[PDB]
Amino acid sequence: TMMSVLANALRCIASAERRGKRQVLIRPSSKVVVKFLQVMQKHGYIGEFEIIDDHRAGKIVVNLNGRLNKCGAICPRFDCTTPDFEKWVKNILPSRQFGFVVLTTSLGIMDHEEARARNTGGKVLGFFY
Amino acid sequence: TKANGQHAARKLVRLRRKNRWADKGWKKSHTFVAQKANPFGGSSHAKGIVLEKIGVGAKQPNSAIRKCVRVQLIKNDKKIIAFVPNDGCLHFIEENDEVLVSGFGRSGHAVGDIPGVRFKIVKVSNVGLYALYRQKKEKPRN
Amino acid sequence: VRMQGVGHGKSASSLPFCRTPPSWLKIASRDVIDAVCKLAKKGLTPSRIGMQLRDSMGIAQVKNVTGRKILRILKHKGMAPEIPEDLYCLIKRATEMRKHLERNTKDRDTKFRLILVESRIHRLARYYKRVKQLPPTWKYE
């Protein structure tokens, strides 16, 4: 089976992006997968997306503008902290300039940049370039 | 591969503890059979009493005769061979003289063109043998 | 994936995309209920009750034309079986294999199948004594 929802979604996006395809299908939907997409659509990396309803589990559909290069998943959801933002941001990303790690917090779902700003660490979620 | 789970820890630990026994660079440290085997006890040097001078051959690609010394060890009562590592200083070693003994280079493999010998004679009667070779001191028979 | 042994199949039954009752079904909750319980007294399992209903009366789903499905009906009227459907069936198949094997001890296939069916029944048992639906002293044999 699949033991991470995110992993199932963002291996469709990455593959599709490397083939230059301008839409992708996503088999499941979660409250979580939504939030992840939302982020990247603000910062300009996605055109739009639709959630469709089968009344069992939804099928997300996304429009890629080709502005992504990867969307990963950090699977164990390891604990990152106020000092350790530095660590992750160096090690898994090609840059500090345009690398975006996305984290979970009690507050919501947000970029590392906004995480530091509000001074709360948390468990990591995923990342994109 | 490996396990990425949160509570996966103990499987990882026990895996490493198993696979370090396939390393010989782990055994050489932790195991005391290695220590026992080494003729110095794993000490830097040891002293011995010269028994006999033994002429030793050489391997096929480089034909030579090599001058070696059959020595007995005071510490453990083991016997060992060692090489005289200067030109024409076989003289300065004589039978029943105390002598020091060292390792040389790689100490798990024998040196080229002398099989079985990893051991070179640094000092004869606590005098530097190099000092005798390139004259400064003279050997005591005192 | 198939639980035990090889198999990938996609043979399945879907749902209607309309969860409200058809216009050609003008039958009320009560008529549906009555039909279920009536049939049940013959000793029919819920699986065949639904089949009889859908085919004859055009019923979309029991759940769509009543507020509850087939077991909930039965339970409330005290006709429900105390041995779940899936468990019972396996035990029947099991015993029948054991007949065949009693006669034929050279039969390789049905032996291995019985081993499967056994451990499968055990999984069910274990389940239904966590989620109480059998006594907690239940055992296959």
Next chain:
RNA sequence: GAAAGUUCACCGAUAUUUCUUCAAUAGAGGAAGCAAAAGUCGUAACAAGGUAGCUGUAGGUGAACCUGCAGCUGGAUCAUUU
């Protein structure tokens, strides 16, 4: 009040003897491993290596090996009644 001494209980050194466990150790003879030589006997493997090769197994033979049985191709074949 109180000493020498008496009896009994308790703690118990040490010696003796047995057992357990750990470490190190001599030995007729037999058998392997490794390293040498300008020794001896053959020609097995690599070419279809001149008996295709190899794996498993059992037996045989002075050696390398050989033979039966079932497989693999890492074969000398990706292939010949639509």
Next chain:
RNA sequence: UGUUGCUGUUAAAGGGUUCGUAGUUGAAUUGAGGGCCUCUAAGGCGCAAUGGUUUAGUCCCAUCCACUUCGGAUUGGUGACCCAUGCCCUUGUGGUCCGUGAACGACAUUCAGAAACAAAAAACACGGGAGUGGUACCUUUCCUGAUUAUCGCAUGUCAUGCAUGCCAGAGGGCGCCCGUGAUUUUUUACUGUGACUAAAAAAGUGUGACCAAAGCAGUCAUUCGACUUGAAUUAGAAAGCAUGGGAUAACAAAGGAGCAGCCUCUGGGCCACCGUUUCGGCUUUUGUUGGUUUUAAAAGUCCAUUGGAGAUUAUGGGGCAGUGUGACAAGCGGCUGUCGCCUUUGUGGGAAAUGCCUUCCCUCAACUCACGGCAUCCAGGAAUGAAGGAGGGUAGUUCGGGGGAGAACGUACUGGUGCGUCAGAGGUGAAAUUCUUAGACCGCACCAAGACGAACUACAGCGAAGGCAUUCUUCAAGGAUACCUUCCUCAAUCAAGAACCAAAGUGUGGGGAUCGAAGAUGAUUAGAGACCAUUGUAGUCCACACUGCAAACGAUGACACCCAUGAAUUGGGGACUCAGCACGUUAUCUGACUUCUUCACGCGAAAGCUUUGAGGUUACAGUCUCAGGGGGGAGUACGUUCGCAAGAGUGAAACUUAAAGAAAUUGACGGAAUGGCACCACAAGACGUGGAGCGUGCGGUUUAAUUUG
């Protein structure tokens, strides 16, 4: 040694397969709200107006008529649409404000959130305490009343009482302590902040010990000291502590009829309350303590109806009775299989009103439709969903070298018997071993015994793997497909443990045709149970036991997601007589096996791999598990567990060596292949040399030297 950050097709390395516990990992749902004003803040696939001669267009029309690929024509034409502001709908930014979903009263109260209520709240509300709060804390509405302390009046006076009282009522408002109440309170990881934590050491701030490792010192006026002299500060694993945050997780419970409080005004009746053992406990006030007893609230319980709800219709469902309506076949009727029963009887249709009503046709499935009596019975419909996640059901006499049993069938091999013939036959490179007048070989006929099921049989099928092929019958299964049936997380993978497992081997019994290790004999050869030939035992077969050792290979672990090109095949589904059938073609789909010898991206050292991964991996993380750490020594030794034994599992070290190994390339070689070429190669065939007698050269020996290349 690869947690961050390793590798396992071929280089060291995926276990022979399956089941399966500890352990590890595990799908989706509960939902993070809004309005009015300003702002050229943007977009507009909304839009009234009104603008625009081609100062911009296309459909229609006009004229031609051009057989068919010319055109222009003006006001053309609210047409189409193009460059414009509000009317816009969103959204950016800006303010404050919401009972912040729906619901309730709206000025004199409850006033723009309050009593009630909703929701939230145990950090709460429900009763209460002077030993609570530095002498019992604070306060505003409503009336009573005003000490205006003319330190005076009252209480109190045997007083160190030279001591208090100086607001009735109203709801209250905090603080303190205790009692009572919860339909099921509630926690933890994680994070932010804060507490609590020896120095030395480290990071660090200040400072010219002459600098420097260092130290915690010193520095300045200028004297009979100043700097308020400095000697900062941070980190310091888990674990414990307090308090915010509430996304992601984990713990625990539930498992759905295995259930579940309607609230409330008032009145009456009864009633001890704990408790039940030979008499125990008990709430204030009546001055107080000791005794009994009453009245009364409270609580319980019974009846009564006062107002209001309800998350599932009580004027209701369920079951009886009467009448008329619609109706089948016999009994009856039409006057031609089918219609009706004293008509019509299908349903909308018809008529008539200002889509709807009514009238009219007048609601069929043997009880169906309409109306009425009142007689009954009696809580029950309020539940997340149904994962291209697992289990189960039903069906096509579905699909298949799947598995077991029983019965027949086929030739051949070998042997026997009978009928005939007559000299060689077996066998090989050539032979010989071997068999023959006691008639072999050979031909035909028949019988015996045992094995096997050719061709058809495939870049096909089924089975978990190992494996599986004549026909008929028979027993229990398995996979795929079809479904608006059922269950609702029951899962994935695996130490431990369990089951299956090619051939050869072992035990016991039956069988023994063929082939055949060992053995025997004959060749081949320098030597040869060799390879070859003739024989031949174990074995080869079956039943019941063991063994579990294979190149058990796809040298590729299992589950899951994404991933393109073309043509086929195998099953299912989709558009009289084993028969509303079977096959084929076109197209589609799900499930299997594989090919592109035009497989896309990509990967790899290369060979190669490609939805069927070794791809999506230094941009390194989907999940689980097993194995490997230079080559030998070794799968050896020792120990130990299993086995009758053969063997199987587990598994070192001493010592030694610097390479071993993988793939590709260029050369060379082959008793490898193919195409060619040479009297230094051969065929046909002419002439010699090769052993004599001579000359010459070389070797040997000789000798002063027999110079030497």
